Amino acid sequence: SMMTNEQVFSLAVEKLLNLEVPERGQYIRTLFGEITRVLNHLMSVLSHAMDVGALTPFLWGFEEREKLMEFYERVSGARLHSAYVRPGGVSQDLPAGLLDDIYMWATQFGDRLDETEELLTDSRIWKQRTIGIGEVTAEDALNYGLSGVMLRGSGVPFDIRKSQPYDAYDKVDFDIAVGTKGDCYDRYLIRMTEFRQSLRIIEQCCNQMPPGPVKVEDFKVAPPPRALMKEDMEALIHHFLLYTKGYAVPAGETYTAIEAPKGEMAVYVVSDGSERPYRCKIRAPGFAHLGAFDHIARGHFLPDAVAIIGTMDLVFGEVDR
């Protein structure tokens, strides 16, 4: 989940900078917010399915990730680590014809979930491995500070995209999913629903795409275009000054939380009036969930340990930030 991760630091700096991204910028972050969620959930659900033992859905989905990572590489350049969402909008405008290729994948992708639900959703072996495994009460989920799927799996209908709208999420419409039993099979259904709801927004983001700029038109927080850097003395100075000293963030502190695919991911950032942040604490949703492993896994069997880890969607790069 790359473009969601850098979105929370971009929002944190934007909140301190007191500058707001234009409309087309916030639509690009919403579209690639959904594509990232599809990329993350494919890694989360299918490996959880693979760790149970279903090898086939892992490979069907990874072709889609290869198909989705093409979109990352066309806009940013690198397949995985797209340093695209920078504080003050995005890096570069969308390449022409990207929407046509994004939409074309959207039509085909709709069947991919169906076959995934064919070998998992109604299979009795998949139900047995997950039903009643790792029961988390909604009252007790709040106590450990769980967020994301392992808080709506327990019945709480809370979602950060709705509690604090951001980056053209208010414009689109989508339905959140809430479970009732708080076990792995419920969290699977929620995650599968997150596929279709995310695909629902991708259609809306492609359709409702506005025109205009893609980054804030302030040369002090964004590089000037190269056609203008070599023509305008004011443009060259800000290009030279941006990359040597950087822009200074006004003093303050902030804690902006977003709906990461794992859950509530937030950064605590303290600004000391300098071009370098003073304190940067990162709240990793996988960090808190792994803490609640003792509460969840107690009383289950060793095969249930794999199911519990899989439904936690652990990425120990995020855990050990």
Partner 1 sequence: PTLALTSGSIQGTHPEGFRLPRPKTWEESSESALSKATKWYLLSEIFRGLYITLEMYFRAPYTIYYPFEKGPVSPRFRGEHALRRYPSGEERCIACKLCEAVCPAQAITIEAEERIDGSRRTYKYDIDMTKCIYCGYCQESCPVDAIVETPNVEYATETREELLYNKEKLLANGDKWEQEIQYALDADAPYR
Partner 2 sequence: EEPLPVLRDLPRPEYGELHAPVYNPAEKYKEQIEELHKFGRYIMGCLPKFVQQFSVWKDELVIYVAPSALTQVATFLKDHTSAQFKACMDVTAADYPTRTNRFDVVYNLLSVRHNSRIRIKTYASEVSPVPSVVPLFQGANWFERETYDLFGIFFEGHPDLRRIMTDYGFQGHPLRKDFPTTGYTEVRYDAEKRRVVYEPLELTQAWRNFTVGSSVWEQVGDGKDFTPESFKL
Partner 3 sequence: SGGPVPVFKKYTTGSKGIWEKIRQLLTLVPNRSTGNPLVKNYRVPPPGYYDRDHRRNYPRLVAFDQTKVSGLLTLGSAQNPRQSVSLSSTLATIDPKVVKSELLAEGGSPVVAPSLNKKMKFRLTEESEHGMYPEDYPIRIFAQN
Among 53, 59, 103, 108, binds partner 2 (CB under 8 A): 103
Nearer to partner 3, 133 or 318 (CB): 133
Site for partner 1 in 212-241 (CB under 8 A): 223, 225-227, 229-230, 236, 239-240
- DSSP bridge pairs for 267: 256, 282
Q: Provide the 8-state DSSP code for 56.
A: H
Question: Which residues, 6+ apart, have CB-to-CB distance to 187 below 8 Å?
Answer: 149, 150, 153, 179, 311
- Of 175, 244, 294, 298, the residue at the interface with partner 1 (CB under 8 A) is 244
Q: Which is nearer to partner 1, 111 or 320 (CB)?
A: 111
Provide φ and ψ at 139, rounded to 5°: -65, -40
In the shown chain, the binding pattern of residues 168 to 187 toward partner 3, with x for contact by CB under 8 A and - for none, equals -----x-xxxxxxx---xx-
Given 58, 60, 109, 158, the residue binding partner 2 (CB under 8 A): 158
314 HSE (CA, 13 A, CB side): 18
Count CB-CB contacts under 10 A for residue 96: 7
Q: For residue 298, state whether it binds partner 2 (rule: CB under 8 A).
A: no
Q: In what order do the strands lie in the sheet with 279-283?
A: 252-259, 264-271, 279-283
Task: Give contact residues for ligand PLC (rule: CB under 6 A).
Answer: 124-125
Residue 125 interaction partner, one of partner 2, partner 3, ligand PLC, none, beta carbon < 5-8 Å per kind: ligand PLC
Cα–Cα distance, 26 to 75 (Å, whole number):
15
Task: Compute and round to an integer the Cα radius of gyration of the chain.
Answer: 21
- The answer to whether the CB of 5 falls within 8 A of the CB of 260 is yes
CB of 95 to partner 3, least distance (A): 5
Cα gap 193→201, rounded to integer Å:
13
Q: Determine if 93 is a binding residue for partner 1 (CB under 8 A).
A: yes
Residues from 238 through 257 that contact partner 2 (CB under 8 A) = 244-245, 248, 250-255, 257
Q: Does 105 bind partner 3 (CB under 8 A)?
A: yes
Assess 177 for contact with partner 2 (CB under 8 A): no
CB of 6 to partner 3, least distance (A): 21
Q: Cα(314)–Cα(262) distance, rounded to whole angstroms?
A: 8
Give me the helix-helix angle, 2-17 and 23-52, nearest 10°: 140
Q: What is the CB neighbour count within 10 angstroms for residue 164?
A: 13
The reply to whether 274 sits near partner 3 by the rule CB under 8 A is no
- Under rule CB under 8 A, residue 122 binds partner 1: yes
Q: Enumerate binding residues for partner 3 (CB under 8 A).
A: 16-20, 63, 67, 74, 95-97, 101, 104-105, 107-108, 110-112, 114-115, 157, 162-165, 173, 175-181, 185-186, 189-190, 193, 196, 200, 217-218, 220-221, 250-252
